[PDB]
Design a protein around this nucleic acid. Structure first.
Lengths: 98, 176, 141
RNA sequence: UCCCCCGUGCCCAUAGCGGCGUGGAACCACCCGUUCCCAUUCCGAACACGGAAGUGAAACGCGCCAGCGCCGAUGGUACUGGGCGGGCGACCGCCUGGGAGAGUAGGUCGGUGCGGGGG
RNA sequence: GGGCGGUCGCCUCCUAAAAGGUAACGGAGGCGCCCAAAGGUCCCCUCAGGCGGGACGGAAAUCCGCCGGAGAGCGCAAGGG
RNA sequence: UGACUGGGGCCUGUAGAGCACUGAUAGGGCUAGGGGGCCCACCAGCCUACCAAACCCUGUCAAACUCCGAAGGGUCCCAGGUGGAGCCUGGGAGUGAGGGCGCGAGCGAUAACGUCCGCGUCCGAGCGCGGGAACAACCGAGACCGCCAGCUAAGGCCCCCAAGUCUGGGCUAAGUGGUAAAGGAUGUGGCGCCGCGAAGACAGCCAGUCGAGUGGCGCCGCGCCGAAAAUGAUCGGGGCUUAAGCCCAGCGCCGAAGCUGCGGGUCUGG
């Protein structure tokens, strides 16, 4: 298996989860303990382009505008099998830094 | 065979065993309740009956409900039963360990042998309406070599054994 | 004699004898059996004298089942020594037997000879015995 | 409110192994490539990137099944806080509050939050 | 009793009577070091066994395929993990 | 706020049990090797009531094994709880040799008025008092003093010796009682459930007469042998047999320095 679950290395609140599918890319801001999503956005499942990495940034900036609107400032970055590369949401706005 | 049983309120299991009246219980998927046969009587019955044959229990309702003896709890010291369980039947292919006859005389009664009756009650499935008995097996060409077991027997269609087949049934083993 | 061929440790503690038998209390191997009334430790050389007697009696006979094992070691200090200086040497092996344990069994012999051979055994044993048949020893379900 | 699928938590095997049916419009995966970012103690196997000719075979989702696995009473014992006995002693019995483990009847191929996409 | 013998500090398990603690010249083992990577962090990867199948190749030299939640491994004793 | 107690919430791996792990284990099945007969050395081949792995079935064992697991115990919260309880600071000590009993273990030989720990008690310091023949620690009971008053406790009520030769139903003939085991016995008394009895032999002389109770193991109460040591014997003594012994009821008395009654002292509190 890809056990992975570095996501287990989350202490000090507010998780920005990312999902990379062969066609698409999705993301939801989660408050655990409660067990509840607060904010979201997706790839063409949000109605959008047919590219890849360009599309990523777009969904990113999307998530940003919506979150700050609710009063949410800072978080922590995910993707389980990340390998932080390519399809990155290197977006302004959200205060999770980097 | 019959036996007078009587309802229990749940009071002083010590008192009853001392007053001749062995406590037990009856149960099935719709009714489990508490009863007290008499030791005196149950002995004649179970000693002939056991759990190959079937008992029937005449209560203060005329209801003579049909049963099998699931479990008997012995005393460990000075062998003498403390408690009996009664399985209430009707018409479902429930289990039981029907006995076996060992008809015959193996070749191992002459070149140094004894019959060992490993598992002389084998388990099976079949509805209450069908209650076989002595499921004989013949032995005659069983010398001191190894010996027969499991599915090698005489199974009335309706009978559907729950064994393996591998569970050893008998053997022909040397002298002293 | 009749001892274990390997053990985690060579010597062990003594321990008390509570009642009951816990297990071993229904016949389950041969036709006639020998049950215990008094608790005791039974030595290997007793078990043997009991075994050989059984066979002795009915020569070229049936099968005997010795349903107990001398798994426990026996310590004893050399003669005329004082106390302390640590535990003794192991001088033999015994089996713990409590009220109700079925110790022995025979099968495939005349009721006549069974009754007899079992009785002789009890004369080899440091406890009170009783003989038994094949009654409600049916722990099936 | 009612279905289906994609993410993500709580329950901690009554969610498990193995069998047998299904599902591709949409999701998902496999698939097409190796120029490009990024890869291999050798391998585009894996990570990774650009694609959409094909397939639900594999993987995953959804059912149905009890062979193995897992759960499991009720009764009755074992043992025992406290009180009191019998015996000369290994040890055995009563009274009152508590009460297993095995084994039996039986139960199980899950339940349940939050958010998305589709009718 | 004293001598002869044995022991004297430290760690692990049992004796220990389901908090802690608890004796005997009671049962059974270890320490008086090591690592310049055997340390920090980031990114990867998963065992031992077993049954197949393969030139030299044992009964595991290295190769391939199924099964195998941990029985392997963690410098050295045992225990916990 | 104390000891102790009621109601809640955590923590725990013993008693007991179990075989999933570590090891041990009796028998059978299934089945690598090895031994050995058939036999050929060109190496194969078939059999064997031989020894025998791994694995499965039945049956079990373990301080240093545990899938499981009580009663209890530990602690924290809220209450009851005014006690020669509790907490804080300081002045004065002695003790640092313990002992028996009950329960839970180790050592020992499931020996010792033995020895090591753990939980409780009494002696120590209650050798003050009652019971136990006598006797620190077994049973009863915690003694300020006085009384020619009354009730009790353990243990007792035939005499020594206070109080029942009290009442009702059973057992025992050994002085058992008045202190011993494996194992032996048609001792007794009470329960059994099995043989087979006008195919009328159970016991006795040709089987006819004989005309009925006969054997067979197995439970329970009480007793019998098994039972030999060294100054004179004895249950404490005399003496007890439908008991003055044993079992089961019932009513009544005697009995301490305990509890009441009356009088007195001293110290606290009010």
């Amino acid at each position: 298996k890809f056990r992975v679950r570095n996501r287990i290395k989350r202490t000090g609140r507010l998780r920005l989860s990312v999902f990379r599918s062969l066609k698409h890319i999705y993301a939801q801001i989660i408050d655990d303990e409660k067990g509840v999503t607060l904010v979201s956005a997706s790839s063409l499942a949000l109605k959008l382009k047919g590219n890849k990495t360009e599309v990523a940034r777009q969904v990113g900036r999307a998530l940003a505008e919506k979150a700050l609107a609710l009063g949410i400032k800072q978080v922590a970055f995910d993707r389980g099998p990340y390998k932080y590369h390519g399809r990155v949401k290197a977006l302004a706005e959200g205060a999770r830094e980097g | 065979y019959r036996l007078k049983a009587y309802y229990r309120e749940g009071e002083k299991p010590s008192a009853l065993r001392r007053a001749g009246k062995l406590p037990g219980v009856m149960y099935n998927r719709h009714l489990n309740r508490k009863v007290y046969v008499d030791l005196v009587e149950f002995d004649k019955v179970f000693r002939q009956a056991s759990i190959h044959h079937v008992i029937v229990l005449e209560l203060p309702d005329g209801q003579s409900l049909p049963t099998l003896v699931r479990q008997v709890n012995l005393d460990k010291r000075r062998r003498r039963p403390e408690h009996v369980d009664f399985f209430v039947l009707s018409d479902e292919p429930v289990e039981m360990y029907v006995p076996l006859r060992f008809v015959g005389t193996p070749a191992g009664v002459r070149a140094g042998g004894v019959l060992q009756e490993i598992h002389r009650d084998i388990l099976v499935k079949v509805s209450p309406r069908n209650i076989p008995e002595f499921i004989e097996v013949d032995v005659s060409g069983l010398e001191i070599g190894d010996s027969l077991h499991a599915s090698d027997l005489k199974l009335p269609p309706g009978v559907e054994l729950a064994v393996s087949p591998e569970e050893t049934i008998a053997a022909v083993v040397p002298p002293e | 004699m009749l001892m274990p061929r390997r053990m985690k440790y060579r010597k062990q503690q003594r321990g008390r004898l509570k009642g009951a038998t816990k297990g071993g209390d229904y016949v389950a191997f041969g036709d006639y059996g020998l049950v215990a009334l008094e608790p005791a430790w039974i030595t290997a050389q007793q078990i043997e004298a009991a075994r050989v007697a059984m066979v002795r009696h009915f020569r070229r006979g049936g099968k005997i089942f010795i349903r107990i094992f001398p798994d426990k070691p026996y310590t004893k200090k050399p003669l005329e020594v004082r106390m302390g200086k640590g535990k003794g040497n192991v001088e033999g092996y015994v089996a713990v037997v409590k009220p109700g344990r079925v110790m022995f069994e025979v099968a495939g012999v005349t009721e006549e000879q069974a009754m007899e051979a079992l009785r002789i055994a009890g004369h080899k044993l440091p406890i009170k015995t009783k003989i038994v048949r094949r009654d409600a020893y049916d722990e099936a379900q």
